[PDB]
Amino acid sequence: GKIIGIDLGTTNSCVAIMDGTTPRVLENAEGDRTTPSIIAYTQDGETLVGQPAKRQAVTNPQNTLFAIKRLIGRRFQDEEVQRDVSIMPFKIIAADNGDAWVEVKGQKMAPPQISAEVLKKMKKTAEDYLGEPVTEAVITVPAYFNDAQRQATKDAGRIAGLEVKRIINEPTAAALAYGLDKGTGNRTIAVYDLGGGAFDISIIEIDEVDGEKTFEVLATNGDTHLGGEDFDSRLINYLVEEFKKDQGIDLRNDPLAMQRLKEAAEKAKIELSSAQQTDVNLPYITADATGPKHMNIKVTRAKLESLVEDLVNRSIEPLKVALQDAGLSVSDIDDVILVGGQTRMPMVQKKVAEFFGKEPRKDVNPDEAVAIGAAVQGGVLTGDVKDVLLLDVTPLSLGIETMGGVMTTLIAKNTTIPTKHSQVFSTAEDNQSAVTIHVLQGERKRAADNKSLGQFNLDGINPAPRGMPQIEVTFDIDADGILHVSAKDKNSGKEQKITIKASSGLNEDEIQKMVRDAEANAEADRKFEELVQTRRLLLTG
Ligand SMILES: Nc1ncnc2c1ncn2[C@@H]1O[C@H](COP(=O)(O)OP(=O)(O)OP(=O)(O)O)[C@@H](O)[C@H]1O
Numbered sequence: 001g002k003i004i005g006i007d008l009g010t011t012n013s014c015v016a017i018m019d020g021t022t023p024r025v026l027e028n029a030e031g032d033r034t035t036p037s038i039i040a041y042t043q044d045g046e047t048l049v050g051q052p053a054k055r056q057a058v059t060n061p062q063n064t065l066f067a068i069k070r071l072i073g074r075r076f077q078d079e080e081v082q083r084d085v086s087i088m089p090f091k092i093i094a095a096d097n098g099d100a101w102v103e104v105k106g107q108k109m110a111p112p113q114i115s116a117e118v119l120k121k122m123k124k125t126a127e128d129y130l131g132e133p134v135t136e137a138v139i140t141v142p143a144y145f146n147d148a149q150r151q152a153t154k155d156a157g158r159i160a161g162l163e164v165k166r167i168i169n170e171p172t173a174a175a176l177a178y179g180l181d182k183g184t185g186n187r188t189i190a191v192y193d194l195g196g197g198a199f200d201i202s203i204i205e206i207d208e209v210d211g212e213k214t215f216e217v218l219a220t221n222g223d224t225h226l227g228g229e230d231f232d233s234r235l236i237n238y239l240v241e242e243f244k245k246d247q248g249i250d251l252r253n254d255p256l257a258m259q260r261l262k263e264a265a266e267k268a269k270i271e272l273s274s275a276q277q278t279d280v281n282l283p284y285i286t287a288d289a290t291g292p293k294h295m296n297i298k299v300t301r302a303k304l305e306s307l308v309e310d311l312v313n314r315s316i317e318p319l320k321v322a323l324q325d326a327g328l329s330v331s332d333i334d335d336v337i338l339v340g341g342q343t344r345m346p347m348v349q350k351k352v353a354e355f356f357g358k359e360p361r362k363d364v365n366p367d368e369a370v371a372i373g374a375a376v377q378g379g380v381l382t383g384d385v386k387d388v389l390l391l392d393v394t395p396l397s398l399g400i401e402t403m404g405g406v407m408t409t410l411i412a413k414n415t416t417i418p419t420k421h422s423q424v425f426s427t428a429e430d431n432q433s434a435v436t437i438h439v440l441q442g443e444r445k446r447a448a449d450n451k452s453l454g455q456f457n458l459d460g461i462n463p464a465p466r467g468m469p470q471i472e473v474t475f476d477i478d479a480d481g482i483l484h485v486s487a488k489d490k491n492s493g494k495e496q497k498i499t500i501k502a503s504s505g506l507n508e509d510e511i512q513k514m515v516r517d518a519e520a521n522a523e524a525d526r527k528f529e530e531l532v533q534t535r536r537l538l539l540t541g
């Protein structure tokens with residue numbers, strides 16, 4: 001029946017549901033509206049999830065899994081995974097197929113199996129509230145997730161016993177949450193998302209026309225090196241160096257001490273969003289030949305700000321890029337929305353307010369907006385939420401080059417995504433053994449006047465006269481906006497394919513110029529195409 005919305009976070013997860021017109025964030029059994037994305041396998045053979053796992057992490061470093069979102073859908077040889085292997089206290093391994101897996105108590109486990117434990121806890125939280133079984137869910141992912149990362153997140157949902165009705169990206173979710181407020185129509189917003197695992201900025205248009213409120217992503221980009229875990233690392237390094245200065249001991253080779261220090265550092269960071277100073281007090285942190293040793297280090301907000309200032313400042317250039325990619329000025333941004341617990345740092349809030357020249361909206365909850373928006377999307381699917389449309393359409397026509405230097409369109413401009421279209425082409429010359437698939441974007445009929453998106457060859461064509469071979473070309477744009485182009489020789493069975501990433505933005509100013517350019521050249525483009533036609537469309541070598 002009902003469709004729950006789940007924010008599956010690097011650090012914390014959250015589940016919400018539509019209660020008629022208003023979404024409700026649901027509390028787990030401890031009373032908490034968020035649940036740590038932490039999974040622990042205990043000595044006695046049971047699996048802990050959430051705060052119970054978090055509480056015993058410091059004593060069970062090998063078998064307490066966290067930050068698995070950094071691994072989900074990734075290959076073991078991925079740079080981020082290799083970077084992750086050294087710092088993580090649990091064992092990260094290569095699966096037989098090369099994926100990044102984990103090993104706990106001799107058991108090899110794929111990331112989706114681990115994240116499924118967190119999603120199952122979100123599901124029971126909802127089932128407890130509703131008093132009925134729950135199986136339909138909208139699950140969110142970062143806007144920077146690729147196909148493999150999205151697919152692995154869907155698999156995690158299914159392993160949790162959920163029907164994954166939709167995946168949507170976290171900034172769009174936040175925008176749906178904000179867009180519930182009154183007076184939010186026909187505005188451009190900036191979603192500044194500083195979570196545990198990454199920084200992400202999205203520019204989203206919320207328009208209201210003929211009673212329908214539409215949500216469209218105009219630009220997005222992210223940086224996984226600017227997340228709250230990186231803030232923690234700066235403070236941890238400071239505490240390590242300070243303890244060496246104070247007592248001549250380097251804690252880095254002591255895993256138990258480093259786990260306690262990581263937890264204390266994060267708590268000190270959080271406290272310094274409220275206070276001007278805090279005390280990191282860790283008794284019996286280690287010992288040497290002269291007995292036990294104890295840590296007591298005062299950290300001021302000014303010191304923390306000095307340690308992470310570069311991280312905060314590195315979030316500004318991604319903002320400038322997103323605005324360039326949307327073709328907008330800061331003066332076009334009508335509201336700024338902060339998402340993510342790391343945006344509660346006063347320094348972050350001031351830097352964002354300074355850049356946009358306006359205070360971020362304070363009626364958006366940075367810890368819950370993503371889950372709320374996922375629940376809104378669920379309400380759209382059931383009909384509980386009316387007059388709301390997530391708008392994702394192609395900005396420009398997409399096609400391939402055919403004989404005579406012509407652009408042949410496979411997907412027309414303004415086609416709703418996801419979409420799939422195929423057309424059969426043939427060879428231009430007798431006994432042609434290969435064709436070149438040149439993928440093009442734009443509105444002109446001359447292939448050379450459009451943008452080239454990539455190209456690949458299909459060879460192995462059996463000898464035959466021109467026009468006889470049947471080459472099926474398929475364009476498929478998936479829900480992640482990624483364009484998949486394939487060419488298949490129907491008589492030989494051979495196929496080749498490429499993947500084309502989504503554009504980082506949609507610049508309507510420039511798109512409309514291109515459209516007007518094409519309209520201004522419409523008759524000239526027709527005459528060009530017509531006498532090329534005087535020679536099933538054909539492909540050259
Ligand atoms: N009051 C605070 N001040 C500063 N940092 C905070 C505060 N509260 C939480 N954090 C930090 O925010 C981060 C967690 O934020 P959040 O729960 O939004 O992440 P997430 O959604 O799980 O991550 P992602 O979006 O990367 O999947 C952690 O680094 C945590 O230490």
Ligand SMILES: [Mg+2]
Pocket residue numbers: 009010170195196340370
């Ligand atoms: Mg998040």
